[PDB]
């Protein structure tokens, strides 16, 4: 009952913000630009500093014209509407959002420890206890999101930041969506796609549990289970129902992964009658104190090295390009709700 009541309150609070989203809560000239932290085909993420408070933030900047071109309008509206409505210890906090003639802006807490991807590639692989510490946080986060009828759809190490306590902050809600029943959009990242996405089915939250299997495998092995030079070859492996496990994997790890990387979505852990509890009660998680993880009382396997809240050392170097704002409004109608 404690979990039922927690999730009922969580959904109540989400729905209130979902139905009445915040809008236009800052503007660009309230911030100083510090550094480009990452780039994409329709936007970038910048470290900025608020000029009055001195607080640092990560600012995601999306070019409205490129969003339309890349057919991401609904996705960008989902992303902001969801992020402004959620509240969970392992989800990045959106502090402000606004738009101007050219761009959409989402201003989030800055996490100087950087992406799990960098740390994983530096160390090679994580031990099972280390992978399990992160996996537990994802399990709780998906239990939260799924209860709110949200599917995340982009789990991968690049979207998981490691904070000053060594805990995960899930960022990048660009593919997240509120879904009752099924959804159909082809999206995600190739190595992490469930078979039913590849096969163009109407799919559900089970795709997030598949992706958790991929992430746990990658954390514990150092590489993902389905790898190839071309996406088409990745997709053939994903749909095949065959995965090879390193000999160093524990038997409990292999068993959990066979049930998450289950090609038949109707047999996949997280999507059965017992829902998330088939995962939480699995032997691989026997040492996990779920409440202690939620309360952030477990000492983390490691804390990233950083010098302070403005340190960018754990992010990489990108060409610094202008943030141009047109004299004329672009795509006003498409982004009215933002
Ligand atoms: O906002 N975002 O989508 C982000 C932010 C930071 C990061 O490292 C990756 C993605």
Annotate 271-307 with three-state secondary structure.
CCCCCCHHHHCCHHHCCCCHHHHHCCCCCCCCCCCCC
Q: For residue 205, give the DSSP letter.
A: T
φ, ψ of residue 141 to 5 degrees: the values are -65, -40
Nearest to 35 by CA among 321, 326, 308, 324: 321
111 assigned ligand-binding residue: yes
What is the residue with the minimal CA distance to atom 4 of ligand 1?
172
Letter string b/e over residues 156-186, b meaning 16 or more CB atoms within 10 A of that residue's CB: bbebbbbbeebbbbbbbbbbbbbbeeebeee
- Can you say whether the dihedral through the CA atoms of 283, 284, 285, 286 is positive or negative? positive
Q: Quick check: 210 and 268 in contact, CB under 8 A?
A: yes
Confirm or reject: Cβ of 170 under 6 Å from ligand 1.
no
139 assigned ligand-binding residue: no
Q: Quick check: 64 and 334 in contact, CB under 8 A?
A: yes
The C-alpha atoms of residue 96 and residue 172 are separated, in whole angstroms, by 15
Nearest to 152 by CA among 217, 91, 87, 216: 91
The C-alpha atoms of residue 185 and residue 204 are separated, in whole angstroms, by 11
Tokens of 323: 């943030």
For residue 17, what are the CA distances in angstroms to 33, 70, 76, 81, 93? 29, 28, 17, 9, 14
The C-alpha atoms of residue 152 and residue 231 are separated, in whole angstroms, by 21
Q: Which atom of ligand 1 is nearest to the CA of 60?
A: 1
- Helix extents (H) in the chain: 2-19, 64-69, 73-83, 116-123, 128-147, 195-198, 206-221, 231-240, 251-260, 277-280, 290-294
Other residues' Cβ atoms within 10 Å of the Cβ of residue 246: 13
Tokens of 156: 């991968």
The C-alpha atoms of residue 265 and residue 253 are separated, in whole angstroms, by 20
- 296 contact partners, CB below 8 Å, separation of at least 6: 89, 165, 167
Q: For residue 270, give the DSSP letter.
A: T
Residue the block writes with tokens 């492996």:
237
Q: For residue 43, give the DSSP letter.
A: E
Confirm or reject: Cβ of 91 under 6 Å from ligand 1.
no
The C-alpha atoms of residue 34 and residue 50 are separated, in whole angstroms, by 11
Confirm or reject: Cβ of 172 under 6 Å from ligand 1.
yes
User: To test ligand 1's pocket by mutation, which of 41, 44, 60, 93 has the most ligand atoms within 8 angstroms of CB?
Assistant: 60
Determination method here? X-ray
Confirm or reject: Cβ of 40 under 6 Å from ligand 1.
no
Centre of ligand 1 to C-alpha 170, Å, is 9
Question: Helix (H, G, I), strand (E, B), or coil: what is residue 102?
Answer: coil
Tokens of 241: 């129902």
For residue 263, what are the CA distances in angstroms to 52, 100, 155? 52, 44, 18
Nearest to 251 by CA among 206, 224, 282: 282
φ, ψ of residue 48 to 5 degrees: the values are -130, 165
C-alpha 43: how far from chain center? 17
The C-alpha atoms of residue 125 and residue 298 are separated, in whole angstroms, by 21
Tokens of 98: 């606004």
Centre of ligand 1 to C-alpha 310, Å, is 16
Tokens of 11: 């959904």
The C-alpha atoms of residue 58 and residue 69 are separated, in whole angstroms, by 25
Nearest to 163 by CA among 232, 96, 109, 212: 109
């Amino acid at each position: 009952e404690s979990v039922k009541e927690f999730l009922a309150k969580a959904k109540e609070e989400f729905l209130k913000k979902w139905e009445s989203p915040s809008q236009n809560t800052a503007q660009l000239d309230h911030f100083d630009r510090i550094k480009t932290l990452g780039t994409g085909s329709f936007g970038r993420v910048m470290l900025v500093k608020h000029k009055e408070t001195g607080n640092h933030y990560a600012m995601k900047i999306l070019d409205k014209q490129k969003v339309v071109k890349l057919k991401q309008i609904e996705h960008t509206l989902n992303e902001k509407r969801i992020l402004q409505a959620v509240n969970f210890p392992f989800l990045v906090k959106l502090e402000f959002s606004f738009k101007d003639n050219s761009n959409l802006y989402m201003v989030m807490e800055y996490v100087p420890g950087g992406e799990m991807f960098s740390h994983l590639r530096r160390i090679g692989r994580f031990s099972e206890p280390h992978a399990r510490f992160y996996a537990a946080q994802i399990v709780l986060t998906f239990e939260y999101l799924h209860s709110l009828d949200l599917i995340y759809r982009d789990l991968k190490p690049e979207n998981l930041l490691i904070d000053q306590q060594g805990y995960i902050q899930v960022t990048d809600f660009g593919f997240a969506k509120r879904v009752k029943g099924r959804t159909w959009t082809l999206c995600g990242t190739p190595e992490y796609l469930a078979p039913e996405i590849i096969l163009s089915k109407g799919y559900n939250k089970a795709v997030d549990w598949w992706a958790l299997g991929v992430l746990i495998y990658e954390m514990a092995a150092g590489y993902p289970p389905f790898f190839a030079d071309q996406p088409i070859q990745i997709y053939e492996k994903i749909v095949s129902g065959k995965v090879r496990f390193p000999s160093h994997f524990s038997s409990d790890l292999k068993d959990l992964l066979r049930n998450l990387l289950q090609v038949d979505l109707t047999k996949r852990f997280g999507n059965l009658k017992n829902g998330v509890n088939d995962i939480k009660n699995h032997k691989w998680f026997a040492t996990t104190d779920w409440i202690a993880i939620y309360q952030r009382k477990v000492e983390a396997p490691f804390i990233p090295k950083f010098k302070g809240p403005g340190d960018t050392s754990n992010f990489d170097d990108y060409e610094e390009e202008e943030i141009r704002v047109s004299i004329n409004e672009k795509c006003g109608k498409e982004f009215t709700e933002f």
